[PDB]
Ligand binder design. Structure first.
Ligand SMILES: OC[C@H]1O[C@H](O[C@H]2O[C@H](CO)[C@@H](O)[C@H](O)[C@H]2O)[C@H](O)[C@@H](O)[C@@H]1O
Ligand SMILES: OC[C@H]1O[C@H](O[C@H]2O[C@H](CO)[C@@H](O)[C@H](O)[C@H]2O)[C@H](O)[C@@H](O)[C@@H]1O
Ligand SMILES: OC[C@H]1O[C@H](O[C@H]2O[C@H](CO)[C@@H](O)[C@H](O)[C@H]2O)[C@H](O)[C@@H](O)[C@@H]1O
Ligand SMILES: OC[C@H]1O[C@H](O[C@H]2O[C@H](CO)[C@@H](O)[C@H](O)[C@H]2O)[C@H](O)[C@@H](O)[C@@H]1O
Ligand SMILES: O=P(O)(O)OC[C@H](O)CO
Ligand SMILES: O=P(O)(O)OC[C@H](O)CO
Ligand code: NA
Ligand code: NA
Ligand code: NA
Ligand code: NA
Lengths: 330, 330, 330, 330
């Protein structure tokens, strides 16, 4: 069993926590945030998106007892003082959004943890991994990043399309659920003016490096992909809309067959495949990081196609954070 | 003054009515729908999207008095019985969605009107005209179609891009506001299963012929564009996301300059241009049918680019219905 | 096992179906609606509010196979032709909204069923039963009504409050989720003008007979309660806000104790009790028809108090439809 | 002309600014916030709720030029250093939410301003005023409060009902639009746990002292009113739902006549009256602080009634902030 400490009990920290409950190989043993234990219990117990917690939650002497297991609660803002070794933490899920460089995340190792997984793209050269794309490149590094939710959706699909047909170039849009960085009514967002506008009222364009970042996890695609996002008023689940030019001519039935074969074979549990008349809520709670929507896509011709793939930006990414923790512990 | 009769007082009929109040050349003299006059007055007076009617509305003897002018109200299910000649109607804005062929719309001419403008794409070979694409091709037809709200956004932008740089092949997506065909909660939609899913909860993939329809108004683009839609939980305003491969190399700054020149020149009032940090609500009430969003788009390279253009799917289209009524009346 | 036929596969029919899967005493053996079996299977499999169906669904020879059991599918518009006897149906869940009188619902009995439960308030004097109010008054009737979702929330709470403290007079408000009768954007609703206004954009006042209907199930409260509704932009879960004047003085802590005792005692599984910091989504999927929110209510004084109670208007009501089917089948 | 400085360019500061443009008696001459001038120009120019600014906005040398008038922009967090006398400020609209006591707001006077109006209820004994209730009690104080949006809706209506019929006791609910203190998805709100839950997904109960505060502006009602709130997923406009017991029996027609007479007489421009089939968006942009909805209310009997009154929580309150500035300057 790998013992995990969570730093940051936001959306990702809390959904990582829930996902860990259903996995025998990983045990959460500690959570650090600036929240009292009783408030943390409340945030875990009730979830507007994913419903009530499946289990028991007790607060006792400032710590959490979840399904009978003691969880150490701390409130340190300097990771160096977290004493992770005192709870035997193997890997830290670094989920605050604040320690996305080697120098900041290394404090967890100073504090006693063996390894760190950043639940977001690194701001320095800390290596990023995406399951289905490059987990097999992991080379023992003590600090790694799971990239972003959007890159976790695009890269598996781009890998299948490229391996089979050769991507000449592609442009991506993600139509993305509202997230915690947005505002309920027009409010201050000085580093992202569009992102301050009322989330429930608007389609909001947003820049994203997620498509370009596919080149870090699939170097053969470096320079061949970029894109952008529209934030829309849904609370969870997002969709990738990938427009690509192909070297090898492929009918839409041939593209479907290639994606389905990968979903049922090497990318099982990462890439999914459906031909049903799905909508976004049909993926609320989905663990696959990329579910190809066969009927939604459209080809102009055998070398120019628009492909659609769903992702639960909360659940799929959180599950693959856990997958990366397990992988680096092998 | 062109005297206009409106058949159908749905979203388009009512926003056409409001827009006509601000035009000196066009006067609404009659409305036909299966609604009592007092209910018609209520729907005109109050609008959840566009606010209160700017003017006075009263009911007198079963007809409407709007800004002191009498509007004849009827409830005929057969357009042949509309007696448009009794109110001197020149052009009918045919806005029921039910009479999109020559044989059905021509009943208005039997009923006394001189010309008909369909407020939707024709279902036979009734010619479509889109301002900024092919109004200059109009050659005296007495029944025409103003195409669709999406075709009105894509066509003007595609023409500028094709005329300057040559579109080899393009794929659209329209991220589109919720419309009246959708359902509040998951409900029956036997001919469009995804479309019956609750509109406020979901991102809903939808098919659209708008991109392919650009070939009807711009024959040079026939076979070069196709696309799809995502319906999202906003009440009005939509956006075109056009991914094109270009024959002539063009940097993103050169593309911006070409679009801005058309917006400030020949296409003024049809194609708009902005470099501001806009979001969808910034176009609620916008009259331009295609507003290019300079900062939102992104180029992968000089021959492969993603272009973004906004449209108020209610207001822009309705204003151009009136423009086509004026154009065919010259 | 009670064999049940469902007439009407709308929101209530489909959530009754799901809830029946978890009950050993009731088995759905047939569904009737104007939908093809493959579309029925789609609506059952995917739900924007309640997630994916927990089980298997397939179509075989025009009928449904759900969890390996065959469900007879028909599309009869006249219930007299439903041949319920051919599938051994004991009770019909009459869920179309169209047959809310004895003469119409009794066609099911001519068609071979033994008893009928209307999933809405009867429009004649067909008796209504509400769990926690008057199930014990049932005296062998073969056609009954389960009242409405709001009456199911208010009645159990009103009974506890009246029995303990005496309600002299009370006024409700239900802040209610959007329903299928509403419109996505401002549209025609000739018999309820406010109800045609776009559901996602507005707080919509609505009339309701639910408070007055409590007198039918609790004759002692006849003439003592009335109220109204506000429809708001949420997809499911509603709340009762009951303002009552009391005959016997009761502090808010004494009121809480009385409600908690009923929730933990005689009214267990019908009336719930919480002191947590809950919000509407915390009751999405809740089976209790009335969950008292201790912290949300407020007393002005010992004889004048505002009480708050939650209900999943889909799930709670549907589960109590099944409870009434079981109760009349004893 | 009264020269005004705005401290805090949030929703209230910006809508006060817009409202001031349409009033000759008040001139905004300076704005202080922690935002650059170019970002302030953007927030003023575009508004998701109220549309584009009606006028011209230029940034020049770090200050704003709005409709040709120079507006001094500063970014001081210590009001004592604002040098309001250097721009000749008469009254400060204190709109940060941070200086709601005499000691903090007095810094504006230290800094050169003559008077301060707090755009929120005071936290100390700073006197509150509500137009239509107690402006005539203002006695020259240099620091005052305009109370809250909800008290500005309830107090005018409560005054008419009490003056005519005698309020024995009342309980209020406000069904309230989402505001800036809420969260887009479940997030941290340690002082208001329910208020951190995703705003677009939930009906959210909230405590409010607004009803009790009516007793400060109408002492004759002290101890006779209290209530609570439900926050719901709309972006603006809220509604008061007042359940009251009356000393003098009054038919609902008599209540309507009393409210209408006050709306057309002494409370003109504060209290409005409608019998139309309105919904919340019909009051987006409304300047009256309380619009009585005659058809929405319901009486149980001649002494126990539920009354409904609308308010644009942004626009009405902002206009009455300006009214209070003008009043204290008389
Ligand atoms: O931070 C100052 C800049 O604000 C805007 O730019 C930011 O926000 C944009 C979205 O509205 C992003 O696209 C951009 O990356 C951010 O820098 C504004 O557009 C700029 O003019 C300001 O310099
Ligand atoms: O009408 C029966 C068919 O329903 C679906 O197809 C419709 O709905 C789709 C959106 O869900 C549209 O894309 C499609 O064009 C419609 O025909 C279902 O997908 C089909 O299998 C049914 O035969
Ligand atoms: O059907 C005609 C009437 O429409 C309205 O009244 C209906 O709609 C209201 C909600 O907007 C309901 O309260 C009312 O009970 C319905 O009858 C309108 O208010 C009436 O004046 C019309 O006659
Ligand atoms: O701040 C700690 C308390 O948090 C909650 O109470 C706050 O938030 C409530 C709404 O969820 C408010 O009603 C209350 O006024 C606030 O104090 C929690 O309910 C309490 O148990 C905590 O002590
Ligand atoms: O591009 P067209 O043919 O619609 O022409 C519209 C121009 O405004 C003509 O002046
Ligand atoms: O209050 P009633 O009559 O519905 O009784 C329901 C109780 O659960 C009976 O045991
Ligand atoms: Na585990
Ligand atoms: Na006109
Ligand atoms: Na069963
Ligand atoms: Na002014």
């Amino acid at each position: 069993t790998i013992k995990v400490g969570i730093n940051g009990f936001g959306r990702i920290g809390r959904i990582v926590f829930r996902a860990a409950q259903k996995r025998s190989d990983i045990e959460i043993v500690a959570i650090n945030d600036l929240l009292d234990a009783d408030y943390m219990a409340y945030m875990l117990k009730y979830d507007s998106t994913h419903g009530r917690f499946d289990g028991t939650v007790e607060v006792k002497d400032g710590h959490l007892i979840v399904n009978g297991k003691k969880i150490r609660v701390t409130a340190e803002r300097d990771p160096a003082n977290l004493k992770w070794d005192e709870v035997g933490v193997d890997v830290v899920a670094e989920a605050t959004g604040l320690f996305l460089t080697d120098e900041t995340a290394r404090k967890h190792i100073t504090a006693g943890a063996k390894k760190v997984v950043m639940t977001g793209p690194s701001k320095d050269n800390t290596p990023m991994f995406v399951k289905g794309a490059n987990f097999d490149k992991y080379a023992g590094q003590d600090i790694v990043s799971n990239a972003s939710c959007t890159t976790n959706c695009l890269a598996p699909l781009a890998k299948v399309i490229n391996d089979n047909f050769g991507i000449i170039e592609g442009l991506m849009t993600t139509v993305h659920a509202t997230t915690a960085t947005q505002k309920t009514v027009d409010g201050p967002s000085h580093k992202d003016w569009r992102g301050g506008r009322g989330a429930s009222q608007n389609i909001i364009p947003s820049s994203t490096g997620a498509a370009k970042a596919v080149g870090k996890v699939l170097p053969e695609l470096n320079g061949k992909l970029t894109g952008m996002a529209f934030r829309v008023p849904t609370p969870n689940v997002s969709v990738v809309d990938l427009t690509v030019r192909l070297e090898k001519a492929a009918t839409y039935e041939q593209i479907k067959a290639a994606v389905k074969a990968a979903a049922e074979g090497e990318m099982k549990g990462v890439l999914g495949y459906t031909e049903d008349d799905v909508v976004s809520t049909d993926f609320n709670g989905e663990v696959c990081t990329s579910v190809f929507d066969a009927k939604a896509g459209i080809a102009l011709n055998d070398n120019f196609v628009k492909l659609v793939s769903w992702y639960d930006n909360e659940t799929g990414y959180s599950n693959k954070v856990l997958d990366l923790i397990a992988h680096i512990s092998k």
